[PDB]
């Protein structure tokens, strides 16, 4: 049958980056070439395996990690990067295979005012291990005094709203990101097209 990418890319809501979503995609006949010629995808960089040849490869399962970030943070969704996203929100591993497909989406996700519920993790005691979402909301201890469950000086809540607006630049606009993470294993492959 036809592969369900309309529930993935054309979805009505994308999860905020601190709590992303993984959607297993198996039992497909998937044409990866028509998704390359969409004329809407800004950043299309495929690590591990080169683009324009995915129609002649099958895999065991496809897991599309999808989220939403601003314009100057699409470079952090990559192997080996850093910042306030790839260290504390969503960390890719080193030898990850697959693409990070992102496109400019100011009309849908950004609303005038805040769109105050696309949060992101800011403060954590350590860097994230790879592919580890962390939905914990305990308050971060900055100094040496104990926080005692109350935020204030030296004790900060780790979630800041992104605060999207259609008046800001193309570096402050919510770029919806889809990470087509797929890797086969010692099994008969499932997901390929013609």
């Amino acid at each position, epitope marked *: 049958n036809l592969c369900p990418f309309g529930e993935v890319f054309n979805a009505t809501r994308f999860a905020s980056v601190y709590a992303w979503n993984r959607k297993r995609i198996s039992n497909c006949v998937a044409d990866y070439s028509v998704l390359y010629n969409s004329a809407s995808f800004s950043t299309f960089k495929c690590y591990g395996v080169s683009p324009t040849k995915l129609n002649d490869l099958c895999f065991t399962n496809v897991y599309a990690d999808s989220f939403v970030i601003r314009g100057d943070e699409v470079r952090q969704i990559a192997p080996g990067q850093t910042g306030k996203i790839a260290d504390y929100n969503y960390k890719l591993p080193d030898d990850f295979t697959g693409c990070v497909i992102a496109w400019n989406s100011n009309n849908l996700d950004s609303k005038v005012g805040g769109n105050y519920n696309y949060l992101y993790r800011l403060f954590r005691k350590s860097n994230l291990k790879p592919f580890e979402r962390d939905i914990s909301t305990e308050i971060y201890q900055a100094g040496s005094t104990p926080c005692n469950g109350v935020e204030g000086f030296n004790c900060y809540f780790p979630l*800041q709203s992104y605060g999207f607006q259609p008046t800001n630049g193309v570096g402050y606009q919510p770029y919806r990101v889809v990470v087509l993470s797929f890797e086969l294993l010692h099994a008969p492959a499932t997901v390929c097209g013609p």
Partner: antibody
Amino acid sequence: EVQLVESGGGLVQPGGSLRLSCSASGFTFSSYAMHWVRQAPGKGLEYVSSISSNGGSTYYADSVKGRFTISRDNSKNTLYLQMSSLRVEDAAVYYCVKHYQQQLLWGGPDVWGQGTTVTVSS
Amino acid sequence: DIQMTQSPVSLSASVGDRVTITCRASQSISTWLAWYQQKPGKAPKLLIYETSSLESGVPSRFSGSGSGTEFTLTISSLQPDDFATYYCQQFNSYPWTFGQGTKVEIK
């Protein structure tokens, strides 16, 4: 346009008291946390105190706590810093700053005032 | 109480050079740094916020760098309006410790 003016200051005997002021105009005063940062003549910048956006949480530096008191009045758009039991070490100018953030991820000030000279001698 | 040691303390750089200033901290702050410019007599002026984001209203010759412990403010080409001291400031942990300073003498 944001602008900050500081008041008070002058000459005081050792062991005396002096209240400064930092009146502000150009922004919503209740939505910002703002600090005091001092600088001795011919020396480096030094942090002394801060205050929250609603007068709740106060914070002093290590060597100045127990002798200073900071308060603010959002209805008057002022920031007050009271001193008690002064020493000769606290002869400096006292700059008044304000945050760049509104109320979270607390770090980094935005604009700087103009300072108020205080002197302590006999 | 993160002790930041600023280097160099004083230097001689004329018009037509490229200068750098190192402000190194002990406890690991992480992209929480501002730079300053204090002409002698009045308050400092902010140059860089969050160690990379160039503040509006200052010329583009200033540019931040660095992440983690040490940072390097750079100036591409020196100008006659650089006769001031450049300070560094951390704001990760709430006792703010400013640097020592850098007396930029233009001979």
